[PDB]
Subunit: 288 residues, 4 copies
C-alpha cells in the first residue's frame, strides 16, 4: 500500500518558489515514511504554476528522490508537450495530467485527444489525475482503455468510483486522493495521494502499518481524528492551512502559498492552532 | 441595449496568435454595429492565454478601437497585477476579471481579497466577469457592494440572477453572457456579451434595432433561430465551431482555436456546415 | 397571454381541506383577472393530497369555473388512472401530471410509459407539469413528441428550456412557472403559472395588461418588486407564507397549509408582514 | 456488523400487495442470516405505499419476526402519526422515517418539527432514514443532536458522511445503504441496509463472516462482483430488476413492482438474465 504525497510548493513572500524549502520538506517526508511524491498536483498549486515553475520543481526534487510523478497539465497543449519532452530525459516514476479545465461543455473527444497526444510522445508511464470537483470533468474508463495508463489518482469522495477503475482497467494502479477516505483506500486500492501527508505523514504511515498488522480499530480511530481536522481546515482554506501546519507539526518553515491562494494571516494562523490543539494532542498520543 | 462581443483569439496551426486576423475580425464586427469588444473572455480563450498573449491581444485591438474591456484573470495575482499596471497606461473602457478558478472550496474572503487587489491598483473602471459554470464560484453582491464596480458581465442561464445585480447595485451596468437569452437581456439589462456576435453580429444588432422599434415578435423569431443554432454547436464544441462559422457567415479566415480546445477536423467542419445550412438560409432571409 | 394560478388548498387546523375557502378564493382570483386555475399543483400541495382530496378539490372548483387544469400525479398509476377516468366525465380544460418522483435513477422509459398510460385513457387535453427541482427528472421534448400534448407548465429558471418546448413541439402551449421570470414569460411564451398569483393577482394581471400596451418599463419595475418579495418569502417557506399573504393582501382567510408544510407561527406571520411592508407599499402605489 | 434488509413489497399484476409472498421471502432472508428487516424503505416502495399498505406490510412481517424497523414517512404528518400510534402497540425494533420530500426549498426547521412530532408520540426507538438523492434534503447532526435518535440509515455514496454521524452522535448506530460500499461499511460502521440482500443475502452475509475471520481479500472479491452487478442493473431499473433476480437466485416468485416503478417485460427479464449469467456463476463458485 503506497503512500504518495502531493507535495506543496513553498513560495516566499514575493511569490517566488523556494526550492531549498521544497527539498528540505521532501527529505523529511521520505524519512517519515512517504513512498513517493506527486509533483505539481493541486496541493502543489499545479495549475497556478508556470511551465518553468513546474519544471524547476521536478529538477529540485530529483536531487532528493527519483520516485516522482510529474504533473504537467495546462490549458495549452504545446506547453504540456514541452514538459513531456523535458521529462523524457529524467529518470522518474511517471508523467501525469488532470483533464482540461475551466471551459464548460467541451466534447468528451477533446479529453481523449488531449491524453492521446501526451501518450504519443511520453517515454514514461502515464498516470491520470482525475479530480472532477476541480476540472468539471470525470474521465471514464472507456476513454482510458485505449491509453497506456499505468496509474490513476482519483480525488473523489465515492470509493466505488475508484474501485471501478481497478475493475475495468486490469493491471492499472489506483490511488484515492481524499484525506477523509484514507482508511478505506488502504483497505482496497493501491494506495493514497492525500494532501495531509504534508503535515501528518507519520499518522498516515501509522494507519498503513497498523492495517498491515491487522489492527483496524486503531487505524479507524486515527481516521476519525483526521476527519475532524479536515472539517476545521476547510474554514481557513485547506491548502493554505497546510503551510501553517507543516511548520507546527514538522518544525521547519515552508513559506506561504501564492494568491489567489491567500496565506493565512498571523491572526488566522493563531486561531487555527488553537482549534486543532485538542486533536493534535490526541494524535500525538496515539502516534509517537 | 449594448451589444458587446467577447472576441475570439485567432491562432495559426502552430498555436501562435494571428494578430492580423484579429484586427480584421474586430474591424468587421465594429462596422456591423458591435458596441464594445471584451478581450480575453472565455470565448477569446482567456485562461488558456499566457500573460504576454493577453497583453498582445489588447495591443493589437488597441490599433483598431478604444472600445475595449480587458480581461486579465489568472491563477497568479502577481501576473494579474502586471497586466493591470500595463493597462493603466492605455485609454480603454475598463478592466475585468473572472474569479479564481480550478481550486475547489476556497473561502469567500479569498475571492474578496483577489478583487480588492485589482481595485487597489487599477486606474480603470472595474468590470466583474461572473461565470459560475466555468470558475465554480458565484460572486455575491455582498463582496460587490464593497468594490468600485462599474459593470458586471454575468454568464448565467438564470436571468433573475442577472436582474438581481441591477436591483442591488445601483448604477452598475449589467450584461448577460448567454446566447440563448439575448432577446430577454435586451429587454431588461444594459446589454449582452454574447459569443455568437463573432459570426452573426448583424443578426444580434438587428434584434436590438427591432426591439428599439417595438418589433418584438420579429426579434423573438431571430432568437428562436439562434437557439436552434446553439443546440447544433454543442456537439462540436461551441467555441471551436465559432471559428468555422466566422468564415462561413463573414467571409474571412480567423484560423483555429488552440488544443485542448481542439479545432474541428475537415470532416467535422463539413458536417457542421450541412447541419446549419437551413438555419443560415432562414437567418439571411430575415437579416440582409 | 394567459395568467394561470396554481391555487392553494386551504386546510383547517386539523388538516382537513376547507372547500368553502377554496371556492371563495377562486372566485376572487377570477374577479381580479386570473384566466385559469391549475388544481393540485405544487402550490396546491398536490403530492401531499390523497386521491380523494384531489378529486374533491376539482369538484369544488367546478362550481366556480370550468377553466381548470386537473393535476393527478401520484406514485401509484392505478390511482392516477382512477382520477383520469373521473375527470373524463367533467367539462374541464385538461388533465395534467408531474413526472414520477422520489425514486432516483428510474430509466427514462419509465417516464414515457407513465405518460403514455395517462394518454391512452384520458379524453381531455394532456398538459405536462415539468418541475425538475421537485421530481428530480426533466421531461425532454423527445418523450413528448409521441404524446398528444396540448400544454406544458415548466417550472424552470432557464427560460431557454421553456422556449425549446415551443420550438420542438409545434402548436403546444407553453407556460413558465417561475415567479421571478413572469415579465419574460409574458414577452415570449403562452403565459405563466406562477404561485404569487394567489396573493398579488392584480400585480401580475397589471404586468400583462401593461405589456399589451407596450409599457415594458412599468412591467419590469413590478418584476423587480416581485423578485424582492420572493427573496423574503423563501426564508419562511414560500408556500406557507402565501397563506398568510392571501389574508393580508386579499382580505379573507384561507386557513393553513398542512405539515410537513408547516404553517407560519403567529410570531413568524408578524415578522413576515413587517418585512414586506415597504414592498407592499410600493406595489399598492403602482397597482391601484 | 449487522446486515439489514430493506425488503421488497411483492405486488400482483393488478398492483395489490401479495403478503403471502412477502412472508415467504422474509423467512428465507432470515434463515440465510439477515439480522433485521427494514419495512417500507425505498426498496419496499415506501413513498408509493398508502398508509394502509404500510400498515399491512408490518402486520404480515410481524407474523414472521420481531426484528422489524417500521418506516412510516409520508407527505401528511397526520397519516404518519396514525402509523406511529399503530406501531406503538407492537413489539418491534424501532420506527423510522425519511425526511419530507418533493417540495423544494423547505426551511430546515420544517425538517426538525417533522421529526420532533414523531419523537413526541412514538414509544419506540427512533431511526432516521437519510437519503438525500431521493428526498432532496440531507439531515444534519444539528437537528439530530436534539432528538432521541437510536440509529441512522444513511443511503449515501460518500462514506465519510456516514462515518461523521458516528463521531458526532455518541452511541447512535449507523448503517450505510449503498450496495457498492458494503465492504467498507462492514469495516467501519454498525452495518448495512443494502437492497441487494433481497436476492443475494448469502453473499453479503458471507462478506460479513469473512471479515469477522480477517479474510478481507475474499470479502473484497465479492464486493467487486456486487459492483459489476450494480452497473448492469441500472439500465433496467434497480428495484424492478431485484424482483426478477429474487426468483433467479432464490427460487421463489415475489411478483412485480407497481408502476410508475414498471416491471421488466418478458424480454427485458431475459436480457437481464443473460447479462448477469457469468457473474452469477462466479458468485455461486465463491459462495455455496
Ligand atoms: Mg499600437
Ligand atoms: Mg399477526
Amino acid at each position: 500500500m503506497e503512500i504518495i504525497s502531493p507535495i506543496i510548493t513553498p513560495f516566499d513572500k514575493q511569490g517566488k518558489v523556494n526550492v531549498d524549502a521544497l527539498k528540505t520538506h521532501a527529505k523529511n517526508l521520505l524519512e517519515k515514511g512517504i513512498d513517493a511524491i506527486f509533483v505539481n498536483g493541486t496541493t502543489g498549486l499545479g495549475p497556478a504554476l508556470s511551465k518553468d515553475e513546474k519544471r524547476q520543481n521536478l529538477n529540485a526534487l530529483y536531487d532528493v528522490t527519483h520516485k516522482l510523478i510529474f504533473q504537467v497539465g495546462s490549458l495549452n497543449l504545446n506547453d504540456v508537450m514541452e514538459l513531456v519532452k523535458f521529462s523524457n530525459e529524467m529518470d522518474i516514476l511517471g508523467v501525469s495530467s488532470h483533464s482540461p479545465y475551466y471551459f464548460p461543455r467541451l466534447p468528451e473527444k477533446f479529453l481523449a485527444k488531449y491524453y492521446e497526444e501526451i501518450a504519443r510522445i511520453s517515454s514514461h508511464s502515464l498516470y491520470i489525475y482525475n479530480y472532477p470537483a476541480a476540472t468539471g470533468y470525470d474521465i471514464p474508463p472507456s476513454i482510458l482503455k485505449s491509453l497506456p495508463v499505468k496509474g490513476i489518482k482519483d480525488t473523489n469522495q465515492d470509493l466505488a468510483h475508484s474501485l471501478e477503475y481497478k475493475l475495468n482497467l486490469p493491471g492499472v494502479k489506483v490511488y484515492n486522493g481524499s484525506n477523509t477516505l484514507i482508511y478505506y483506500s488502504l483497505l482496497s486500492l493501491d494506495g493514497v495521494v492525500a494532501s495531509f501527508t504534508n503535515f501528518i505523514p507519520e499518522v498516515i504511515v501509522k494507519q498503513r502499518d497498523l492495517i498491515k498488522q491487522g489492527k483496524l480499530d486503531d487505524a479507524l480511530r486515527l481516521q476519525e481524528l483526521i476527519n475532524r481536522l479536515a472539517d476545521i481546515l476547510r474554514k481557513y482554506g485547506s491548502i493554505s492551512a497546510i503551510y501553517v501546519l507543516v511548520n507546527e507539526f514538522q518544525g521547519y518553515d515552508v513559506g506561504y502559498p501564492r494568491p489567489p491562494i491567500f496565506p493565512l494571516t498571523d491572526e488566522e494562523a493563531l486561531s487555527l492552532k488553537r482549534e486543532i490543539e485538542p486533536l493534535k494532542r490526541k494524535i500525538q498520543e496515539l502516534v509517537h
